[PDB]
Symmetry: C3
């Protein structure tokens, strides 16, 4: 049995993707999630949708309760969390509207708790050092890549996401710099969402959608809120189709070994007295 958590990002957090919807507000040991969980189905598969920034997009990236969001999805019984995230492109070949099925990150955040195991919660006791060599589930990523090909979508099979704190966009010097570090796309939300999913033993993958070329590339429209939202208005349907078609495929294969290995990694990352 699988259950798919969906975290919707900017422009890309649409409840109408699920059939048989029911709204459920929850609390967690780490506070309230961004908004109500939306429970529902894609074909025969149970899903749980959550708007990263709230359904009215009122929560900036620095203030998103990543702990509560992941906790809530875990507690509802999710085996997988597949998210969407708008991003800037740091590579000529990654065009606005393209999907990138990211496989790595570089952290540039500064303000965010990255662990459940902070010494202050009885529900997460001990000192936990989660491995991040392979932060995203490669099996979930594989299904996303295969499905995007079946849909004929422009989709990059890997990529390194640099996650900045924000909410400001990057300077040009920063944009240039991130290119030298080997970053391929830029956003404000992947870290610590991916990290906490891993501590939760959840298969996590990210549908990154390029919306702009940040500010490094000449003769392109400058990143701005309006430019991002424009690209998403034009291209959001592709992320929706990809979730709708991927999720049944996840539901039809066997995940017990993958989930057991993740559970083991998570459990053995915690040192108790």
């Amino acid at each position: 049995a699988v259950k798919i958590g969906i975290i919707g990002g900017t422009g890309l957090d649409d409840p109408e993707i699920l059939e048989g919807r029911t709204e459920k507000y929850v609390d967690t040991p780490f506070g309230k999630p961004s908004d109500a969980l939306i429970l529902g189905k894609i074909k025969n598969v149970d899903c749980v949708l959550l708007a990263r920034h709230g359904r009215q997009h009122t929560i900036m990236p620095s203030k998103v309760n990543y702990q509560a969001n992941i906790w809530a999805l875990k507690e509802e019984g999710c085996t997988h969390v597949i998210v969407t995230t708008a991003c800037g492109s740091l590579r000529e070949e990654i065009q606005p509207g393209d999907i990138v099925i990211i496989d790595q990150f570089i952290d540039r955040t500064t303000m965010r708790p990255q662990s459940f195991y902070d010494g202050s919660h009885s529900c997460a006791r001990g000192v936990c050092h989660i491995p991040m060599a392979e932060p995203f589930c490669p099996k979930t990523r594989e299904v996303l890549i295969e499905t995007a090909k079946k849909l004929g979508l422009r989709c990059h099979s890997k990529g390194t996401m640099v996650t900045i704190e924000g909410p400001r966009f990057s300077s040009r010097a920063e944009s240039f710099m991130f290119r030298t570090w080997g970053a391929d796309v830029i956003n404000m939300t992947t870290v610590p969402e991916v990290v906490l999913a891993k501590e939760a033993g959840i298969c996590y993958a990210s549908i990154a959608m390029a919306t702009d070329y940040d500010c490094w590339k000449e003769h392109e429209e400058a990143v701005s809120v309006d430019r991002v939202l424009k690209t998403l208005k034009e291209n959001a349907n592709k992320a929706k189709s990809l979730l709708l078609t991927t999720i049944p495929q996840i539901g039809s294969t066997e995940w017990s070994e993958t989930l057991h290995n993740l559970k083991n990694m998570a459990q053995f990352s915690v040192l108790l007295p």
Copy 2:
């Protein structure tokens, strides 16, 4: 009508630059500014001076209330904010005593709010993502550069400021590293001052004064508090002359289109529900 906010940095925060001075303590939604606003004039031009670290230099860079400072200057009616900032040189050609009219930054701060739009203040509602491609006003910078040439000052026309959290100085490995990233000068205060000025719709520019070569360059005196203050004692008059001569030139040209474009950029960076 222009009104010029002046934020004075280390060694470079002198009330006697203004004629017809009056002290005004203010409060803001983000707390108290570093010290009293000093209201006054340079020739016919209204100005507002504020000591970044307080007039006795009692507030370390991490604890400066950048939000309150920018808010106070905005509320007093400033159209421009021209600041001074001491810095380390990361380039042989940038000698101690030189001025750099910086045009870019790299953020290495970790502790600082970078936005007015934190979800907690009625005066700044919404989610704001300000563009930082061009963080400094190029027209204000142009007048500073032109004026420095008229004064015969050693002045670099551009440069990338890496802003570290401090209050410690950088290690040698860090200094080396920042050079590879393309940083030209190093300080602890540009970020988030520049960012918040942009959200405020204010033309912001920075008179950076090199005081040392940080710790990368052989056979130079090591950076220390005493070395910084020594260089400033010797060279502060140049920043003073540059402000005194630049500000009347700003006052004599037309800023309405520049200010309108900045106001638009700022306003359209905010998403409301």
Copy 3:
């Protein structure tokens, strides 16, 4: 007269190194240290041992009270602080089990106070900007290197430690990146421990022990908590022997000029009104 503070890191915080042990719990203006001070001797030399993470390893790196730990050791009268720290190797030639007598750092921490002089404590008044060009005591390092050679240990004479916030391990993209920045080893605790020791006027040195190759190097066992603790179980005796044999050598040479120079650097880093 010398007195050697010892901070023990992961797997490497063993009270039985000291003869004539007495436990002493203390408080400081910055809160409680990680655990009781253990007072005792190595040959004729007074020492003070403190477990960085508490004796049961219950305090994650982000939550270690670096200020209290250094303060407590200073207040007990330590002239030197020699620490152990497990780390990942970022260089082929630094093999698991090797010691590195690190001489530089790159900060990647985000959550940590790095100064005693925060404006909130009467015991540390003023604005302090400590120089970090040479963060570790070269004389203490020299004795460690010489002693490791006398013991026949695999020991690297220098190295740059990148200190990450954690508690997660690095992604592969990050690991790759830190290699390009010239980092040689990776940990979560050197910063701000080294910085605060310098403000305290204490000779600080670090016995770094490589436990893994992080996640950059093919055909090596992946970093995990279990892998780290396994390497330490196998190799901790080497750090113990090195402390036991180094400390008497420190005790037998003259430190007054070295300590005076450090005290001066620390004192002149503070600006008062």
